[PDB]
């Protein structure tokens, strides 16, 4: 792919984070803490899951960024509507305002309803995410495998501003403590 030139500098929005997340000083890395991180509750925070949004909002154009997932057992990545539900249980689907892929139990799946099996021969250590607002496209790339395509959501009905979306996953196993990191341009 030749999307690298639409690179954008993404930072994480502390105020949207689940209360157990630890966001680095530069707002470029996030990981699961072993306890509540001593923040006040607010209506923006994801309550049920270890999720956080990027600060940037996109309503036009072409945008590209990269995320490091090295050594993680579970995570979700993509974009979502600014107005997604924050509290309680919900599925990751375009009907609920999410365009995502994930790793769970040694399989990769796209967040369609129902979910779609992905075919990845080289487990990725870094994921590239491309959004074309006008075209209604969200695409995912395997940076570890020379940029190979993972998945394309097309005919997307965004229906509002978009925000970068992250889930570090739970760490019940003790094998999923590693952070998500926004990779340099
Ligand atoms: F690839 C990695 C990177 C970090 C990590 N674990 C971190 C958990 C919290 O203490 C710092 C290290 N595991 C795998």
Curated annotation (Swiss-Prot):
Keywords from the named record: Cell cycle, Coiled coil, Cytoplasm, Cytoplasmic vesicle, DNA-binding, Metal-binding, Nucleus, Ribonucleoprotein, RNA-binding, Transferase, Ubl conjugation, Ubl conjugation pathway, Zinc, Zinc-finger
PTM per Swiss-Prot/TrEMBL: Autoubiquitinated; does not lead to its proteasomal degradation. Deubiquitinated by USP4; leading to its stabilization. Autoubiquitinated.
GO molecular function: DNA binding; RNA binding; ubiquitin protein ligase activity; ubiquitin-protein transferase activity; zinc ion binding
Cellular component GO terms, alphabetical: autophagosome; cytoplasm; cytoplasmic stress granule; cytoplasmic vesicle; nucleus; P-body; ribonucleoprotein complex
Gene Ontology terms: biological process: negative regulation of innate immune response; negative regulation of NF-kappaB transcription factor activity; negative regulation of protein deubiquitination; positive regulation of autophagy; positive regulation of cell cycle; positive regulation of protein binding; protein autoubiquitination; protein destabilization
All residue ranges annotated as the B30.2/SPRY domain in the record: 8-185
Keyword Metal-binding: yes
Induction profile: Up-regulated by IFN.
Subcellular location: Cytoplasm; Cytoplasmic vesicle, Autophagosome; Nucleus; Cytoplasm, P-body
Family of this protein: Belongs to the TRIM/RBCC family.
Domain notes: The coiled-coil is necessary for the cytoplasmic localization. The RING-type zinc finger is necessary for ubiquitination and for the IRF3-driven interferon beta promoter activity. Interacts with SKP2 and CUL1 in a RING finger-independent manner. The RING-type zinc finger is necessary for ubiquitination of NMI.
Function: E3 ubiquitin-protein ligase whose activity is dependent on E2 enzymes, UBE2D1, UBE2D2, UBE2E1 and UBE2E2. Forms a ubiquitin ligase complex in cooperation with the E2 UBE2D2 that is used not only for the ubiquitination of USP4 and IKBKB but also for its self-ubiquitination. Component of cullin-RING-based SCF (SKP1-CUL1-F-box protein) E3 ubiquitin-protein ligase complexes such as SCF(SKP2)-like complexes. A TRIM21-containing SCF(SKP2)-like complex is shown to mediate ubiquitination of CDKN1B ('Thr-187' phosphorylated-form), thereby promoting its degradation by the proteasome.
The protein's assembly and partners: Homotrimer. Component of a SCF(SKP2)-like complex containing CUL1, SKP1, TRIM21 and SKP2. Interacts with CALR, CUL1, FBXW11, HSPA5, IKBKB, IRF3, SKP1 and VCP. Interacts with SKP2; the interaction with SKP2 does not depend on an intact F-box domain. Interacts (via N-terminus and C-terminus) with DCP2 (via N-terminus and C-terminus). Interacts (via C-terminus) with IRF8 (via C-terminus). Interacts with ULK1, BECN1 and with ATG8 family members, including GABARAP, GABARAPL1, GABARAPL2 and MAP1LC3C/LC3C. Interacts with TRIM21 and SQSTM1/sequestosome 1. Interacts with IRF3.
Official protein name in the record: E3 ubiquitin-protein ligase TRIM21
Source organism of this protein record: Mus musculus
């Amino acid at each position: 792919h030749h999307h690298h030139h639409h690179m954008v500098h993404i930072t994480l929005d502390r105020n949207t984070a689940n209360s157990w997340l630890i966001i680095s000083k530069d707002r470029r890395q996030v990981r699961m803490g072993d306890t509540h991180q001593n923040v006040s509750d607010n209506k923006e925070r994801f309550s049920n899951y270890p999720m956080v949004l990027g600060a940037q909002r996109f309503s036009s154009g072409k945008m590209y960024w990269e995320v490091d997932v090295t050594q993680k057992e579970a995570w979700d990545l993509g974009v979502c509507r600014d107005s997604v539900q924050r509290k309680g249980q919900f599925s990751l689907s375009p009907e609920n305002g999410f365009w995502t892929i994930w790793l769970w139990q040694d399989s990769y799946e796209a967040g369609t309803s129902p979910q779609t099996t992905l075919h990845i021969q080289v487990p990725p250590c870094q994921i590239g995410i491309f959004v074309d607002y006008e075209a209604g496209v969200v695409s995912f790339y395997n940076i570890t495998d020379h940029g190979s395509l993972i998945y394309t959501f097309s005919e997307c009905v965004f229906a509002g501003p978009l925000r970068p979306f992250f889930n570090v996953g739970f760490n019940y196993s003790g094998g999923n403590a590693a952070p998500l990191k926004l990779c340099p341009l």
